[PDB]
Amino acid sequence: RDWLPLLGMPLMLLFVQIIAIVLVMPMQAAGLVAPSSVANPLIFIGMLLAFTLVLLVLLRTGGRRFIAAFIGFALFMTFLYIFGALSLLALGPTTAAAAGTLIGAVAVTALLYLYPEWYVIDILGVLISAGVASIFGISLEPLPVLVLLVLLAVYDAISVYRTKHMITLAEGVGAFVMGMGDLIMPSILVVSSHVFLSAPTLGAMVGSLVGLAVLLYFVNKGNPQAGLPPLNGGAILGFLVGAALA
Amino acid sequence: LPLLGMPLMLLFVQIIAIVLVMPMQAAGLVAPSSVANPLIFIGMLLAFTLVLLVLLRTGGRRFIAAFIGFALFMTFLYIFGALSLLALGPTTAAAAGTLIGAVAVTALLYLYPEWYVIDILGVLISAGVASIFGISLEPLPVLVLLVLLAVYDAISVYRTKHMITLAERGAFVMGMGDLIMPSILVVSSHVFAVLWTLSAPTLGAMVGSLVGLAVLLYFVNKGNPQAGLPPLNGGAILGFLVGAALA
Amino acid sequence: RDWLPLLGMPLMLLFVQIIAIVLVMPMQAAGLVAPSSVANPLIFIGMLLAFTLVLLVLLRTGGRRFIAAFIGFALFMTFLYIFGALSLLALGPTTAAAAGTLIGAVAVTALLYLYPEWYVIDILGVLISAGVASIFGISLEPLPVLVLLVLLAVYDAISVYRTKHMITLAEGVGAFVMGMGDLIMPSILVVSSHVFLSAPTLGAMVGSLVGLAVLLYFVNKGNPQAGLPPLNGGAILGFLVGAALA
Amino acid sequence: LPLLGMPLMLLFVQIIAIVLVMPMQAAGLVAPSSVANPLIFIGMLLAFTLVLLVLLRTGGRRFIAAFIGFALFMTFLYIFGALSLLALGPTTAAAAGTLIGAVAVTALLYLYPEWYVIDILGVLISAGVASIFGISLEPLPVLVLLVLLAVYDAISVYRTKHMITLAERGAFVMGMGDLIMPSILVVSSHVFAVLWTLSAPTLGAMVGSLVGLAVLLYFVNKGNPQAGLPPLNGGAILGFLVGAALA
């Protein structure tokens, strides 16, 4: 039935979660992170604003492929961190391990720039996303992740509602970034929980999948809704259900 | 009826500016007396704005929209959080209580208000800023800061008025700004040595500001002419010196 | 004869020099400055580039009277330094001295903003200029000032020649800032010389006046020339003549 | 005749890049081997440029005109000054001598040249940058930096070439840049352990770069296709490994 079509996004959710755990492991074999303070989400957010400000001044300052380059470089590096973490727990400190990861990341990034197969895109998007998920999740603990999640969710629903209301007014009364990015969002709580086969934080994983269910449901219905609050609110739901478990 | 309204707005900000002073010094800390403090202050504002605008000229759609929302949220954190949870207080479920409070408010402010809501919130924030600086030091750097600021206003008004005799948001910002300016002599003189019906010379300043704004609103309806700050700013100054020459 | 007309600019030269000396005095009674290194001119120049970059991003970001304000504030402060230095050597550390200078500078700056008498402008321009002259001149020593002067002069002649040649090509083959600023330029060597009634650095003062003579001469002739090299080259000429003296 | 000219330009830059190495380490100092050095390097370039352009978008008339003139003057100071006065040397009238030298040159470069003048100067500067980095560390971070940089080029060429198969200043800059790229394996392998006709494997790299650029110029006249860096960059790399497998 409606299996093969549009299961790929919950697929991507589960996968990213999986790869985030498996990456929880090697990334501490060389540290990484960035104190389970509730101020940590605030630093996160402001810094996110800086990430965008930089990115925008870069785009408006392009840079026909200078923009492509600066991001290409950013990519190259983040993949170095991915791979790096892999071999460095794997073959460990060996020259053949490190060089293994540099060649790996060169290969991958070059590929992505060479008009790949663009199922490939989904795959790398999954990699990257899992990477980030693992990092902040390894970085500090739930209650802070929980605050962060609920905050970001609130911003979102404000954002959709504003522009939706702005649709309903104006008569008479690159998407992948936001996407895969939100693929990441509920998963970071999944890491920073197994960081605090798996726990009762499978619960967070399933609840996040169920949030995604409500989401692709309303999206496959007429007259869309917000996003984060289904995914985060559902991951938090599952997670808190996995407390009522043990 | 709003003819009482805008003085009310002031009176309230002043009251709420004082109430926050106690819990405000549960940390507080911005800027000794030192009159270089007003200068550092000015340059801080000018550089702040210059940066803030280049954020617009480099922004500022969903960016500076959100960016302001964030700054707003933080400032509301300090207001709710620090000023009420320490006023409980302090910690634990109270602190969480105010996170809930400030997210509730900034989210509410965003989206669409209803008259009084925005007035209330502006008043609150204003009281916050007022309290902080009035605390962050004494009534003499404040006296100078005030006369400086006011004199700038009257002059830019005349220049740009005289710059006429030829031939939305920044408004609420500047409004709030005027709600703030006299309140600092009120907090910072409360940081001074008398105490009648709770600090007499600070009362003097307070009424002096309420009458200053009155005179301004009269001339505002007289037509065009109003040197912005110099009524209430300079007049609350007059009132303060009046309530101080008493004790 | 041609006295009263266009002697006012050499007038302004002598005056600024005079006021720069008289200010050499009080400004050390509270220090100021900024090492007689030849790297000092380079720091100067780069920093000058920063002064302009700031000023330009400010103008292009105006600021109808925000621009007016930011500069008004800058002015207010530099006059505080002028006056401040005055009373603080004068009445010294007294409250009445300091408050004297704040009221003084408020008065002056407010005046300048109130459409003054605009001979007044020349006068304040003279004040300011002398102020700056005194500061860098008190700051470090001749050979560095000498390098700085010759450098700046070279930039200038390049600049005029470029745009002049650009005039001669395009057929078929606020001024006060640059002005009073150059009023300042040769005088800083006049300070940093009496800092290293006056010396044989009267020589630098007269030679600078004579440079100005060549300058207002060619300017009052058809087909203009560069500027700095007459003024600086002439001040340096007089100065080096005041070495062949003692 | 310039058919020999552009290889000459390279050959010279390489020579002049080496000559400067000795006096260059009379201070020098930019960036241990460490391959993070190439990464730090890239990010340095990207952030450098991004800033440099926002200087244009915020400039850049008489500003960035002069600003470049200044940067140029400084870099010429280090070339003349440090590389010749310490090579005298060092100090006193020699140092002054080079101030005179570099002001003379940058002023000369500004205003209008004449063919060879700009070529000469570009070559000089290039040798400077080449020398510094080749010194600022060893032939392995350099190997990686090189293959990274080159691979980026071939890919942006194909993308923007393939971005075609639908339907002035930066040129000299990028040119100079290519004059630079292979010379760093030449300096930095001279910073390595053989010494025939003065460092044999560094010779190998050097000829390998001279033939690489040759192959590039052949295809450039073959029509359109030239993956910028990968000929000489990747080829000088081949040559270096060839002259190294010798001793």
What does B96-162 look like in DSSP terms, one character per residue?
HHHHHHHHHHHHHHSS---THHHHHHHHHHHHHHHHHHHHHS-TTHHHHHHHHHHHHHHHHHHHHHH
CA dihedral D147, D148, D154, D160 (to 10 degrees): -170
Q: Which chains lie within 8 Å of chain C at 3 or more CB pairs, if any?
A: B, D
Q: How many Å lie between the alpha carbon of D143 and the closest alpha carbon of chain C?
A: 35
How many angstroms separate the CA atoms of D128 and D124, rounded? 6
CB distance D238 to D197 below 8 Å: no
Crossing angle (nearest 10°) for helices A66-89 and A95-113: 150
How many angstroms separate the CA atoms of C121 and D21, rounded? 56
CB distance B123 to B183 below 8 Å: no
First to last CA, chain D: 36
Q: How many Cβ atoms are within 10 Å of D173's Cβ, its own excluded?
A: 10
CA dihedral B126, B130, B136, B137 (to 10 degrees): 160
Of D55, D58, D111, the CB nearest to C158: D111
Q: How many Å lie between the alpha carbon of B26 and the closest alpha carbon of chain A?
A: 18
The residue type of B106 is T
Crossing angle (nearest 10°) for helices B93-109 and A142-169: 20
Of C49, C57, C159, the CB nearest to D58: C57
- Cβ distance B107 to A158 less than 8 Å, yes or no, reads yes
CB distance D123 to D12 below 8 Å: yes
CB crowding A23-39: b at 16 or more within 10 Å, else e: bbebbeeeebeeeeeee
The residue type of D170 is G
Cβ-based contacts of A48 with chain B (< 8 Å)? none
- Cβ distance A52 to B63 less than 8 Å, yes or no, reads yes
Residue corresponding to tokens 């990430």: A51
Cβ-based contacts of B148 with chain C (< 8 Å)? 76, 106
CA torsion sign for D202, D203, D208, D209 is: positive
How many angstroms separate the CA atoms of C200 and C239, rounded? 7
CA dihedral A40, A45, A47, A52 (to 10 degrees): 160
Q: How many Cβ atoms are within 10 Å of C107's Cβ, its own excluded?
A: 12
Cα–Cα–Cα angle for A178, A183, A186, rounded to 5 degrees: 115
How many angstroms separate the CA atoms of C49 and C152, rounded? 12
CB distance B209 to B182 below 8 Å: yes
Q: For residue B132, how many C-alpha atoms fall within 13 Å in the half-sphere facing its CB?
A: 17
CB distance A199 to A175 below 8 Å: no
Cα–Cα–Cα angle for D131, D137, D141, rounded to 5 degrees: 115
CB distance D181 to D232 below 8 Å: yes
- Residue D205 phi/psi, 5-degree rounding, is -60, -40
* Two structure tokens written together for D71: 């940067």
- Cβ distance A161 to B111 less than 8 Å, yes or no, reads yes
CA torsion sign for A138, A139, A144, A150 is: negative
* Cα B165 to the center of its chain, rounded Å: 32
CB distance D128 to D184 below 8 Å: no
Q: How many Å lie between the alpha carbon of C160 and the closest alpha carbon of chain D?
A: 10
Q: How many Cβ atoms are within 10 Å of B228's Cβ, its own excluded?
A: 19
Of A57, A68, A70, the CB nearest to D54: A57
How many angstroms separate the CA atoms of D177 and D171, rounded? 9
DSSP character at residue B197: S
* Two structure tokens written together for A158: 């404000």
Enumerate the H helices of chain D as residue ranges: 2-19, 21-24, 36-57, 62-77, 93-109, 116-136, 141-162, 169-190, 200-222, 232-244
Residue corresponding to tokens 């205003």: D111
* Two structure tokens written together for D14: 């390489």
* Two structure tokens written together for D201: 């494997």
CA torsion sign for A71, A75, A76, A78 is: positive
Contact: chain C with chain B (3+ CB pairs below 8 Å):
yes
DSSP character at residue B79: I
* Two structure tokens written together for C146: 């000498």
Residue corresponding to tokens 């020259």: A95
Instruction: Please name the method used to determine this structure.
Output: X-ray
Enumerate the H helices of chain B as residue ranges: 2-19, 21-24, 36-57, 62-77, 93-109, 116-136, 141-162, 169-190, 200-222, 232-244
How many angstroms separate the CA atoms of D230 and D178, rounded? 10
* Cα C180 to the center of its chain, rounded Å: 6
CB distance C101 to C80 below 8 Å: yes
How many angstroms separate the CA atoms of D30 and D137, rounded? 8
How many angstroms separate the CA atoms of C104 and A40, rounded? 49
Residue corresponding to tokens 């522009």: A163
- Cβ distance B110 to A158 less than 8 Å, yes or no, reads yes
Enumerate the H helices of chain A as residue ranges: 8-28, 39-60, 66-89, 95-113, 120-138, 142-169, 175-194, 202-219, 228-241
How many angstroms separate the CA atoms of B164 and A182, rounded? 53
Cβ-based contacts of A178 with chain B (< 8 Å)? none
How many angstroms separate the CA atoms of D100 and C73, rounded? 40
CB crowding D41-62: b at 16 or more within 10 Å, else e: bbeeebeeebebbbbeebbbee
Which chain D residue has the Cα nearest residue A68?
D156
Q: Please count the structural domains in chain B.
A: 1
Beta carbons within 8 Å of A207's beta carbon, 6+ residues apart: A234, A235, A236, A237, A238, A239, A241
Of A57, A65, A115, the CB nearest to D156: A65
Contact: chain C with chain A (3+ CB pairs below 8 Å):
no
Q: How many Å lie between the alpha carbon of B222 and the closest alpha carbon of chain A?
A: 37
Crossing angle (nearest 10°) for helices A228-241 and A175-194: 10
Name which of B206, B214, B219, B209 is nearest B150 in CA terms: B209
First to last CA, chain C: 37
How many angstroms separate the CA atoms of D143 and D184, rounded? 9
Distances (CA, A) of C172 to C150, C168, D142: 34, 8, 51
Q: How many Å lie between the alpha carbon of A147 and the closest alpha carbon of chain B?
A: 9
Name which of D127, D121, D149, D129 is nearest D232 in CA terms: D149
- Per the structure, the complete domain to which residue A240 belongs is given by 1-246
Residue corresponding to tokens 């020349």: C122
Crossing angle (nearest 10°) for helices B2-19 and B200-222: 150
Q: For residue B139, how many C-alpha atoms fall within 13 Å in the half-sphere facing its CB?
A: 22
Q: How many Cβ atoms are within 10 Å of A180's Cβ, its own excluded?
A: 22
The residue type of B195 is L
Q: How many Cβ atoms are within 10 Å of C65's Cβ, its own excluded?
A: 18
**Which of A162, A165, A169, A173 would you mutate first to test chain B, the one with the most B CBs within 10 A?**
A162
- Cβ distance A102 to D35 less than 8 Å, yes or no, reads yes
> Which element (helix H / strand E) includes C108?
helix C95-113
How many angstroms separate the CA atoms of C118 and C120, rounded? 4
Q: How many Å lie between the alpha carbon of C66 and the closest alpha carbon of chain B?
A: 8
